[PDB]
Design an enzyme around this catalytic site. Structure first.
Site, PDB file in Angstrom:
ATOM      1  N   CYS A  33      -5.167   0.558   3.387  1.00  0.00           N
ATOM      2  CA  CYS A  33      -5.256  -0.845   3.848  1.00  0.00           C
ATOM      3  C   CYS A  33      -6.650  -1.375   3.543  1.00  0.00           C
ATOM      4  CB  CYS A  33      -5.013  -0.794   5.360  1.00  0.00           C
ATOM      5  SG  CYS A  33      -6.069   0.185   6.368  1.00  0.00           S
ATOM      6  N   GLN A  92       0.833  -1.178   0.000  1.00  0.00           N
ATOM      7  CA  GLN A  92       0.000   0.000   0.000  1.00  0.00           C
ATOM      8  C   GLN A  92       0.917   1.297   0.000  1.00  0.00           C
ATOM      9  OE1 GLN A  92      -1.657  -1.045   4.029  1.00  0.00           O
ATOM     10  NE2 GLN A  92      -1.823   1.188   4.111  1.00  0.00           N
ATOM     11  N   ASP A 146     -10.635  -1.406  19.476  1.00  0.00           N
ATOM     12  CA  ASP A 146     -10.098  -0.197  18.856  1.00  0.00           C
ATOM     13  C   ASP A 146      -9.195  -0.617  17.737  1.00  0.00           C
ATOM     14  OD1 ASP A 146      -8.916   2.396  18.487  1.00  0.00           O
ATOM     15  OD2 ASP A 146      -8.283   2.551  20.630  1.00  0.00           O
ATOM     16  N   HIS A 169      -6.560  -1.028  11.379  1.00  0.00           N
ATOM     17  CA  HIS A 169      -5.811  -1.495  10.216  1.00  0.00           C
ATOM     18  C   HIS A 169      -6.619  -2.685   9.484  1.00  0.00           C
ATOM     19  CE1 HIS A 169      -2.467  -1.997   7.551  1.00  0.00           C
ATOM     20  NE2 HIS A 169      -2.194  -3.240   7.990  1.00  0.00           N
ATOM     21  N   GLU A 190      -1.344   3.706  -7.518  1.00  0.00           N
ATOM     22  CA  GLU A 190      -0.493   4.953  -7.504  1.00  0.00           C
ATOM     23  C   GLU A 190      -0.154   5.440  -6.157  1.00  0.00           C
ATOM     24  OE1 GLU A 190       0.533   6.150 -10.187  1.00  0.00           O
ATOM     25  OE2 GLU A 190      -0.796   5.222 -11.745  1.00  0.00           O
ATOM     26  N   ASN A 194      -1.036  -9.202   5.056  1.00  0.00           N
ATOM     27  CA  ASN A 194      -0.959  -7.731   5.172  1.00  0.00           C
ATOM     28  C   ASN A 194      -0.730  -7.142   3.754  1.00  0.00           C
ATOM     29  OD1 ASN A 194      -0.864  -5.162   6.541  1.00  0.00           O
ATOM     30  ND2 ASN A 194       0.977  -5.714   7.748  1.00  0.00           N
TER      31      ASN A 194
HETATM   32  C1  LIG Z   1      -5.187   1.711   6.462  1.00  0.00           C
HETATM   33  N1  LIG Z   1      -3.984   1.818   5.988  1.00  0.00           N
HETATM   34  C2  LIG Z   1      -5.810   2.776   7.155  1.00  0.00           C
HETATM   35  N2  LIG Z   1      -5.133   3.932   7.293  1.00  0.00           N
HETATM   36  C3  LIG Z   1      -5.826   4.848   7.934  1.00  0.00           C
HETATM   37  C4  LIG Z   1      -7.069   4.751   8.461  1.00  0.00           C
HETATM   38  F1  LIG Z   1      -7.689   5.805   9.102  1.00  0.00           F
HETATM   39  C5  LIG Z   1      -7.750   3.457   8.299  1.00  0.00           C
HETATM   40  N3  LIG Z   1      -8.976   3.149   8.693  1.00  0.00           N
HETATM   41  C6  LIG Z   1      -9.499   1.768   8.276  1.00  0.00           C
HETATM   42  C7  LIG Z   1      -8.749   0.524   8.963  1.00  0.00           C
HETATM   43  O1  LIG Z   1      -9.387   0.294  10.119  1.00  0.00           O
HETATM   44  C8  LIG Z   1     -10.639  -0.366  10.190  1.00  0.00           C
HETATM   45  C9  LIG Z   1     -11.289  -0.954   9.047  1.00  0.00           C
HETATM   46  C10 LIG Z   1     -12.466  -1.590   9.307  1.00  0.00           C
HETATM   47  C11 LIG Z   1     -12.992  -1.497  10.517  1.00  0.00           C
HETATM   48  C12 LIG Z   1     -12.513  -0.802  11.620  1.00  0.00           C
HETATM   49  C13 LIG Z   1     -11.244  -0.236  11.423  1.00  0.00           C
HETATM   50  C14 LIG Z   1      -9.857   3.896   9.632  1.00  0.00           C
HETATM   51  C15 LIG Z   1     -10.814   4.728   8.846  1.00  0.00           C
HETATM   52  C16 LIG Z   1     -10.495   6.027   8.325  1.00  0.00           C
HETATM   53  C17 LIG Z   1     -11.301   6.850   7.524  1.00  0.00           C
HETATM   54  C18 LIG Z   1     -12.552   6.393   7.271  1.00  0.00           C
HETATM   55  C19 LIG Z   1     -12.889   5.109   7.769  1.00  0.00           C
HETATM   56  C20 LIG Z   1     -12.033   4.322   8.583  1.00  0.00           C
HETATM   57  O2  LIG Z   1     -14.187   4.928   7.376  1.00  0.00           O
HETATM   58  C21 LIG Z   1     -14.753   6.199   7.079  1.00  0.00           C
HETATM   59  O3  LIG Z   1     -13.612   6.859   6.541  1.00  0.00           O
HETATM   60  N4  LIG Z   1      -7.053   2.570   7.624  1.00  0.00           N
END
Ligand SMILES: *C(=N)c1ncc(F)c(N(CCOc2ccccc2)Cc2ccc3c(c2)OCO3)n1
Length: 216
Positions: free
Chosen positions: A25, A19, A160, A163, A92, A183
């Site tokens: 992610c 990524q 909490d 990722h 990208e 990952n």
């Molecule tokens: C992955 N690289 C990444 N980076 C930043 C980030 F804020 C997140 N989010 C998703 C990964 O975490 C989770 C996925 C599924 C369930 C719970 C946590 C958090 C995130 C950020 C922004 C938005 C989200 C979630 O949904 C609305 O917009 N992952």
């Protein structure tokens, strides 16, 4: 369920991707789950475009390189009617304008299933469906610098998570249960890009707290 499962051995899993410095992610977790489900449906394993998700799934709630959710990605593919191949729409690592072209769509979905929030339900999903998108609490240096073995972090949260990753199987050490996690930090991280996350240890790092997969 079987005592161990590894969907890699059946052809469901593309190589580990990277990524880069983009909070995508979620997109890599979503493409890995849809790659598995399209393979079960058609017999063809085709890498899918995370860039398509990063650029185009704002209406469903995603925020590009700022983060997003696998279920918002599955909803985008349903609303959109398709998702392009990685080869047609390469990654990208920055959010750009939406370039989706239906000519090069190689996947679709009809919704998604959220798995009940317990590890036995997760195990049953992985054994019966294929690879499953999950979120984990990856926010400890112990994760960043993980190299091998079963990952256990006493300070991990089950609530909490921060990722999105992909559970491709589960098993136990021959020496102690784990989930086998792909990952999106490239092959040089962990065990060729994978991490063994402790399993049946009180939903360690929340791996069963936000688990889902697309329907096809
Ligand atoms: C992955 N690289 C990444 N980076 C930043 C980030 F804020 C997140 N989010 C998703 C990964 O975490 C989770 C996925 C599924 C369930 C719970 C946590 C958090 C995130 C950020 C922004 C938005 C989200 C979630 O949904 C609305 O917009 N992952």
């Amino acid at each position: 369920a079987p005592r161990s499962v590894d969907w890699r051995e059946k052809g469901y899993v593309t190589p580990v991707k990277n990524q880069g410095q983009c909070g995508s992610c979620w997109a890599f977790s979503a493409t890995g789950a849809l790659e598995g489900q399209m393979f079960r449906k058609t017999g063809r394993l085709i890498s899918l475009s995370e860039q398509n998700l990063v650029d185009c799934s704002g209406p469903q709630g995603n925020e590009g390189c700022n983060g997003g959710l696998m279920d918002y990605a599955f909803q985008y593919v349903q609303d959109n009617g398709g998702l392009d191949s990685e080869e047609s729409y390469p990654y990208e690592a920055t959010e750009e304008s939406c370039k989706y072209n239906p000519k090069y769509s190689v996947a679709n979905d009809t919704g998604f299933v959220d798995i009940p929030k317990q590890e036995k339900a997760l195990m049953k999903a992985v054994a019966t469906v294929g690879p499953i998108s999950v979120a984990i609490d990856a926010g400890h240096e112990s994760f960043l610098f993980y190299k091998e073995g079963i990952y256990f972090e006493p300070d991990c949260s089950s609530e909490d998570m921060d990722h999105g990753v992909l559970v491709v199987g589960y098993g136990f050490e021959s020496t102690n249960k784990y989930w086998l996690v792909k990952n999106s930090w490239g092959e040089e991280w962990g065990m060729g890009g994978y991490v063994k996350m402790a399993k049946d240890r009180r939903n360690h790092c929340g791996i069963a707290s936000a688990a889902s997969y697309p329907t096809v």
